[PDB]
Design an enzyme around this catalytic site. Sequence first.
Site, mmCIF file in Angstrom:
data_model
loop_
_atom_site.group_PDB
_atom_site.id
_atom_site.type_symbol
_atom_site.label_atom_id
_atom_site.label_comp_id
_atom_site.label_asym_id
_atom_site.label_seq_id
_atom_site.Cartn_x
_atom_site.Cartn_y
_atom_site.Cartn_z
ATOM 1 N N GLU A 170 46.744 55.507 -3.747
ATOM 2 C CA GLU A 170 46.004 55.409 -4.902
ATOM 3 C C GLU A 170 44.372 55.946 -4.784
ATOM 4 O OE1 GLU A 170 43.514 51.555 -5.049
ATOM 5 O OE2 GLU A 170 44.694 51.059 -6.772
ATOM 6 N N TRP A 200 49.547 49.754 -10.502
ATOM 7 C CA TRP A 200 48.868 49.660 -11.479
ATOM 8 C C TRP A 200 50.000 49.580 -13.009
ATOM 9 C CZ3 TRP A 200 43.976 49.955 -13.085
ATOM 10 C CH2 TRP A 200 43.088 49.969 -12.067
ATOM 11 N N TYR A 256 39.688 54.469 -12.648
ATOM 12 C CA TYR A 256 38.951 55.053 -11.904
ATOM 13 C C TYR A 256 38.931 56.500 -11.610
ATOM 14 C CZ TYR A 256 37.884 50.357 -10.020
ATOM 15 O OH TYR A 256 37.007 49.072 -9.930
ATOM 16 N N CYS A 287 35.844 46.290 -11.392
ATOM 17 C CA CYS A 287 35.535 45.334 -10.153
ATOM 18 C C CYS A 287 34.595 46.161 -9.272
ATOM 19 C CB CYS A 287 36.620 44.842 -9.405
ATOM 20 S SG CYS A 287 37.887 43.695 -10.358
ATOM 21 N N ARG A 346 31.398 43.619 -8.300
ATOM 22 C CA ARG A 346 31.106 42.450 -8.798
ATOM 23 C C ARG A 346 31.949 41.497 -8.889
ATOM 24 N NH1 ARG A 346 34.458 41.658 -12.633
ATOM 25 N NH2 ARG A 346 35.654 43.056 -13.962
ATOM 26 N N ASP A 406 38.598 39.097 -4.764
ATOM 27 C CA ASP A 406 39.549 37.952 -4.587
ATOM 28 C C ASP A 406 39.587 38.194 -3.002
ATOM 29 O OD1 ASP A 406 42.242 37.087 -4.047
ATOM 30 O OD2 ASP A 406 43.094 37.916 -5.617
HETATM 31 O O1 LIG Z 1 39.007 42.047 -4.517
HETATM 32 C C1 LIG Z 1 39.660 42.373 -5.716
HETATM 33 C C2 LIG Z 1 39.055 43.036 -6.580
HETATM 34 C C3 LIG Z 1 39.326 42.744 -7.889
HETATM 35 N N1 LIG Z 1 40.381 41.894 -8.431
HETATM 36 C C4 LIG Z 1 40.171 41.205 -9.639
HETATM 37 C C5 LIG Z 1 38.474 40.662 -9.983
HETATM 38 C C6 LIG Z 1 39.164 39.266 -10.104
HETATM 39 O O2 LIG Z 1 39.473 38.530 -8.894
HETATM 40 C C7 LIG Z 1 40.237 39.455 -11.082
HETATM 41 C C8 LIG Z 1 39.968 39.346 -12.459
HETATM 42 O O3 LIG Z 1 39.070 40.030 -13.061
HETATM 43 P P1 LIG Z 1 37.423 39.510 -13.591
HETATM 44 O O4 LIG Z 1 37.533 38.188 -14.228
HETATM 45 O O5 LIG Z 1 36.764 39.249 -12.391
HETATM 46 O O6 LIG Z 1 36.782 40.370 -14.505
HETATM 47 O O7 LIG Z 1 40.729 40.703 -10.684
HETATM 48 C C9 LIG Z 1 40.943 41.193 -7.507
HETATM 49 O O8 LIG Z 1 41.931 40.413 -7.759
HETATM 50 N N2 LIG Z 1 40.641 41.439 -6.226
#
Ligand SMILES: O=c1ccn([C@@H]2C[C@H](O)[C@@H](COP(=O)(O)O)O2)c(=O)[nH]1
Lengths: 316, 316
Positions: free
Chosen positions: A60, A82, A146, A198, A218, A221
């Site tokens: 990735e 993806w 990205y 994210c 930002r 999970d």
């Molecule tokens: O560590 C990570 C980074 C990103 N996502 C994301 C962010 C939230 O956990 C989810 C949904 O996006 P938002 O609602 O946060 O924008 O997908 C994960 O699952 N894990």
Amino acid sequence: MLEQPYLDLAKKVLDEGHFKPDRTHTGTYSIFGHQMRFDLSKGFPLLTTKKVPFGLIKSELLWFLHGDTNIRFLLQHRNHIWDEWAFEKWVKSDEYHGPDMTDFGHRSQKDPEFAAVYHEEMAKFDDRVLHDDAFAAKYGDLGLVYGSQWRAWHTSKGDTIDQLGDVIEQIKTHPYSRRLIVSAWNPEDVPTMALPPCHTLYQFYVNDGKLSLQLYQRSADIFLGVPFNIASYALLTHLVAHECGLEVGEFIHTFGDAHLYVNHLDQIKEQLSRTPRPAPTLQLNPDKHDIFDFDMKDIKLLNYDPYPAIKAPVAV
Amino acid sequence: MLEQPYLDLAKKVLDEGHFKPDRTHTGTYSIFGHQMRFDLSKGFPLLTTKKVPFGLIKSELLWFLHGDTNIRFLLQHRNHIWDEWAFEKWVKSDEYHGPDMTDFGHRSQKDPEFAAVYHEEMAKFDDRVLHDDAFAAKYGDLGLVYGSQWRAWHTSKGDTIDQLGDVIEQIKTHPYSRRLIVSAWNPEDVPTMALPPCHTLYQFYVNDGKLSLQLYQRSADIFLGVPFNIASYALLTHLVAHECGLEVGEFIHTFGDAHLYVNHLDQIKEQLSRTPRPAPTLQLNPDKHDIFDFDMKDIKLLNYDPYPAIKAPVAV
Ligand SMILES: O=c1ccn([C@@H]2C[C@H](O)[C@@H](COP(=O)(O)O)O2)c(=O)[nH]1
Ligand SMILES: O=c1ccn([C@@H]2C[C@H](O)[C@@H](COP(=O)(O)O)O2)c(=O)[nH]1
């Protein structure tokens, strides 16, 4: 032990996390503002308390370093992270003559027969991105991802900026800059994006011959995503450092909303009873120096001894 | 005591800081990656161990909330923090028929007669931005500055996005979003900017009825700049919370390169022997709710009892 910041982040959300609803009809335990720090000279922070698929991380990151946004490369590398975003686009449009498929990912969770219908529809779309060039060009290209935020940021004047390329030239000529930043957040596009990035921004830093990188994520999970996230950016710090003839220093992971889904609490508890093992070693090809032409065979992960994988539901 | 994160950040740079050269011909003690946290329910984090000019902070934030980029407003408010950037533009162009003035800020440091020449040239330019409309429109407007990044981000299609306006509507309708971000970093413009934004990005968060804000500041001058920086964004968190009928929670300040200039080490040591005093209270006008129409008289700072100001050289 190197992965301890993660175990402490997870134990901490477990104990201070305020319940918060979110997007998915699945709640969360959340904290805001957190920073952990990993000294990349003591090892490579791929987790030993559960098995993380390092091949997936590695292909990735390469797709992003090539500035690519088309899923045909990840699929050639057996990587399907993806897929659903591409698939979602196929199914909302005109050649998709096929079964009921909207709300599909959530529906698969408590799927009827539907799970093998989704999974063979998906295997159709994917074989096709792999073999029909014009299909791949149309439903296999995710667009704003990205690879393009990092390497082909579109300007107002209709041109493209290679943020990452330039920051590497800046690390080479001006190591002490405080402006060595790359950004995936674009005010214009996040209004109508599927998933706004994210991993919003990261900043590089050179001092005493070592290169460090700080990431602002930002949203995270804790269970499923952060093990990958730590490993993608610790990989990037080795890769940019190699390319600049620099030594590795720290990876610093800063969090906005760090959250643990409510249906992952047993599995994290499960993991929290494992003792960490020594960290793997990353070995990078000595002959290649341009990271934009790195290839899977040039990145070696040495001595990784994980505990078994822990399976958990993708919450939606 | 509420300002302790700052004293601990400064003591910490003093003890772990690696020397680093920088831009100005003045070196620094630097650290990378740091986060401090202030519970805005215990007070307003304006420093009591040295006097900080709260009027300056307050009019600067209002200039940004009005989406303004012209120095005529700050000057009307006796605020001169952004003068030199405007002045620099005057002096590199065609009506500036006047004395030798390039390298002026550094030269003022070890100035000949020059210091009163710069300071009366400056008082000329400023009186003129105040009274000649067309001059003000041309050398008083800085352009790309926080007011426009926050409130008139220019898109590719030639239009303007009010990032901040929209995030306030998002806090109102969707408090639990993880996408409540505002950004001042634009890939297109930071290639040829004077100063790319130090306060790169900030993220809002709502939980249990309280609003929190996390700031990513790529670069910080521990002595001179961070006392202002903490106060501008703690002010913003009160202001957006008021406007949304929310209670205040925390301000979290995340740092990229945190640095202490080498010619500020006595003064920080000096400050580090003062005992903190109780924190001031911020009082906001109950009748006004639209923060875009707040005015100096609507923001009250109650019970501030600082130790004397500590003077230190602006390093260049
Ligand atoms: O560590 C990570 C980074 C990103 N996502 C994301 C962010 C939230 O956990 C989810 C949904 O996006 P938002 O609602 O946060 O924008 O997908 C994960 O699952 N894990
Ligand atoms: O706290 C602050 C924030 C910003 N600046 C900045 C950043 C550096 O200290 C200096 C020069 O900019 P850069 O080289 O960091 O880009 O002006 C300060 O003086 N203090």
